[PDB]
Amino acid sequence: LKNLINSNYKDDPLKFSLGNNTPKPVQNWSSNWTKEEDEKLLIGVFKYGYGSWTQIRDDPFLGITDKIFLKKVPGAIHLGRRVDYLLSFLRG
DNA sequence: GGCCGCTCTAGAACAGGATGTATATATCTGACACGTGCCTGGAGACTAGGGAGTAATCCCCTTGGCGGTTAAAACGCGGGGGACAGC
């Protein structure tokens, strides 16, 4: 992930998009989600690493700060699984 | 076209980290006792001279007695002032 994001984007990773890779949607989360929310999450994880979920959610350039919770559906485990899928798909 | 397997989500359990408190253990602190080494004083030895002790005699002082006189002490009595208790 860091190699590909540097390789194209490094001039500014805020340029990043997942592009032609079309991910499967989130399953009925309490928040609407798209390739855009995925892309912003990926840029977050690039800036702050995996599992930095407080910083990932808090960074306002990602626009996440509303969409992700501390029994509302998506949480750290769901975020982890989503990242696992997204990176597996992009590496595929 | 149908059913089962696989994947994801949800719940439950366990462990670790974080924080505060209590308890046990270690360390310090001090004084005494013993050992060691060195130096000084005491102990031992010997001599000479002075002081103390001993003896005798004489003189002065102290103790005891007598007598008289005078002053002091003791006994007595009354009144006043001070001391004591109270408030």
Swiss-Prot record:
It comes from the Eukaryota. It is found in: Nucleus. There is a cross-link at K2 (Glycyl lysine isopeptide (Lys-Gly) (interchain with G-Cter in ubiquitin)). Disruption phenotype: Decreased sensitivity to the cytotoxic effects of 6-azauracil. Component of the 1.8 MDa SAGA complex, which consists of at least of TRA1, CHD1, SPT7, TAF5, ADA3, SGF73, SPT20/ADA5, SPT8, TAF12, TAF6, HFI1/ADA1, UBP8, GCN5, ADA2, SPT3, SGF29, TAF10, TAF9, SGF11 and SUS1. TAF5, TAF6, TAF9, TAF19, TAF12 and ADA1 seem to be present in 2 copies. SAGA is built of 5 distinct domains with specialized functions. Domain I (containing TRA1) probably represents the activator interaction surface. Belongs to the SNF2/RAD54 helicase family. The 2 chromodomains are involved in the binding to the histone H3 methyllysine at position 4 (H3K4me3). ATP-dependent chromatin-remodeling factor which functions as substrate recognition component of the transcription regulatory histone acetylation (HAT) complexes SAGA and SLIK. It recognizes H3K4me. SAGA is involved in RNA polymerase II-dependent transcriptional regulation of approximately 10% of yeast genes. At the promoters, SAGA is required for recruitment of the basal transcription machinery. Present with 1620 molecules/cell in log phase SD medium. This is Chromo domain-containing protein 1.
